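Progress note, project year one: complex with 2-acetamido-2-deoxy-beta-D-glucopyranose.
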Amino acid sequence: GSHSMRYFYTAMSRPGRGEPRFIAVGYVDDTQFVRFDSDAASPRMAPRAPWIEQEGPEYWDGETRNMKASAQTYRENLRIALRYYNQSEAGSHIIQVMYGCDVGPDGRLLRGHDQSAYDGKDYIALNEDLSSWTAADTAAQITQRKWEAARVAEQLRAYLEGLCVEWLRRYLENGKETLQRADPPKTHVTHHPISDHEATLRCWALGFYPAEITLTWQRDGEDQTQDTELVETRPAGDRTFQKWAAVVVPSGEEQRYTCHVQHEGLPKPLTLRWE
Amino acid sequence: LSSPVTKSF
Amino acid sequence: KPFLSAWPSAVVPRGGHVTLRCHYRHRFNNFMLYKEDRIHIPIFHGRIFQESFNMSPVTTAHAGNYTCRGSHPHSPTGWSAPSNPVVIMVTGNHRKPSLLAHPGPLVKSGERVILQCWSDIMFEHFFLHKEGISKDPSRLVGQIHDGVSKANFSIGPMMLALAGTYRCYGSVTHTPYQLSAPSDPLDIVVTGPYEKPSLSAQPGPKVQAGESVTLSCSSRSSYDMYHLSREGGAHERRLPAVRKVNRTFQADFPLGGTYRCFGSFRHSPYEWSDPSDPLLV
Amino acid sequence: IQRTPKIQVYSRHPAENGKSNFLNCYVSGFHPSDIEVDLLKNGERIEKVEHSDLSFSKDWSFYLLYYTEFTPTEKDEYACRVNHVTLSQPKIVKWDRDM
Ligand SMILES: *[C@@H]1O[C@H](CO)[C@@H](O)[C@H](O)[C@H]1NC(C)=O
Ligand SMILES: *[C@@H]1O[C@H](CO)[C@@H](O)[C@H](O)[C@H]1NC(C)=O
Ligand SMILES: *[C@@H]1O[C@H](CO)[C@@H](O)[C@H](O)[C@H]1NC(C)=O
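Model obtained:
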């Protein structure tokens, strides 16, 4: 604990460029473990992490049937959205969905999620109570009325309380030695001149998992939260991550600067300095 | 495991 | 390979219009067209289309099975691989067949329905096509029987993508891309899972000519429209739903027979709620 | 509501000339999803390039990782070439061992 499972769906139309496409990916924490892509010649849900590979054929068959149905549903949703927004059939549009569950150290549900977007903006989301919706506009309000009339939230709540949690627990066990063993960052500080009056100090963290991390620069103990360049955390490609934090310092003042690294894989927070 | 719940707009 | 598409529809009436577009290397220009039998022989004596090819007005000569190849100057051959195939089917060339649903046009979510096409013309093939779809019409070989040809299209398990207005067409043996006039259309509606509304009569279901009676469809669900259907087969009446002080949504149809009502929502005309309980007036 | 890609180019492991490694180009924060990414060795497209499955962040913008096995050298110059609807011409980002 604590852990999460999330599925991410992207359904896209592209009139005149290709057939509509539906891609789904599944994650446990920051680790992707399954994918389905409608563009494949013979689409199937497929393993994307070693610890799910030994799951039996009923798993793959069942998930494939479910994704095929979801793909059909979301292709139709693209058509419906055209009607809701009075848009032409010539344009390209995207529906995105993310859903799943968060659990605590004891494996019990902490929170459920189900959010959808149209063309990159919020469309409709399940509320924290898992029994009501927030619709972002009048179009989404139509969907909200349908879903209330069909009791969709009850079904989704049942999924989130039941299968979502039970399966996340199973995957966390299946993949225990990778999923439940944090990898601390390897860290170092580099120095890059700007002039002979200014310089950049760059604090590096490499090879860490999970992705969550905090890199801060302090100058005699005060956060430089206003003067820190922080690059987006990026994947190494081997299921670990990388990040750096930079600060521009006056020449000869390098020694009042300290980089502070916080990550679950570290026994104690690290305090680094350039030398 | 993915959600079996249909979400028709 | 290029992506070839027909706009607005590959199924098109004689006299109408259809444009073929060949998308390749992020452009729509400089391509050649080919038909299924001549696969390496470009039509119109190798015309190099400078932009999308608009056929208008459509003639039977436009019907066919097309692929395109796009220009690619800096490559071994001058050109791309063949695109996906697009079949232009031209309608309006024979007497229309007939289309009926078994057991009926209102289909419960998850269930199946048969759409039967038939004609006293001997059609070699039948085509079933949902209005507004890009999906290729479904094709079945015709079966001859007692002076008619016919085919049974199975539709389902029923879901929204399958609901809508359907027409069927015939083609004769030696002109398979030339379709008949369309059959009269049939609206196939999916019912459920939305909760059923309530039906009632005011003042009551007992009426004697000539005094007025209004039937009301009501629900706590926020239906935008109600449909009143009377057993016995004239098309449902529709009315907007109105919100009442007690928070119900209701429509009043002023009018014997056995009735049911269904709710539906804005922009969603082919999916209705579960049917109300029946009411005999 | 169109968002141009951010691009980072970097190796999986600390670079050391003559040692097999992985070259990465991470594109993120873009919308819509169509995008073209190539890894380059001296301006020329590397052939055996793979990419991750399309996904997106909490703000709905997409991200993808493109990667190829490679052995860095002093002279060979590697880069990432990215085109997206938001860009008039493809953007080219050099691999800088210090970024
Ligand atoms: C159209 O031609 C393709 C080959 O280009 C062929 O495979 C396909 O069966 C044809 N379709 C029809 C309906 O004849
Ligand atoms: C076609 O469907 C109808 C209705 O179910 C049925 O009566 C008929 O026998 C079916 N098959 C044939 C070959 O007519
Ligand atoms: C709500 O009000 C309507 C309209 O006056 C009335 O016909 C109906 O009986 C009421 N429904 C309920 C549940 O009270």
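Residues 37 and 82 of chain D are 5 Å apart (CA to CA).
Residues C 244, 246, 248 surround 2-acetamido-2-deoxy-beta-D-glucopyranose (ligand 3) (CB under 6 Å).
No further modelling is planned for this target in the current period.
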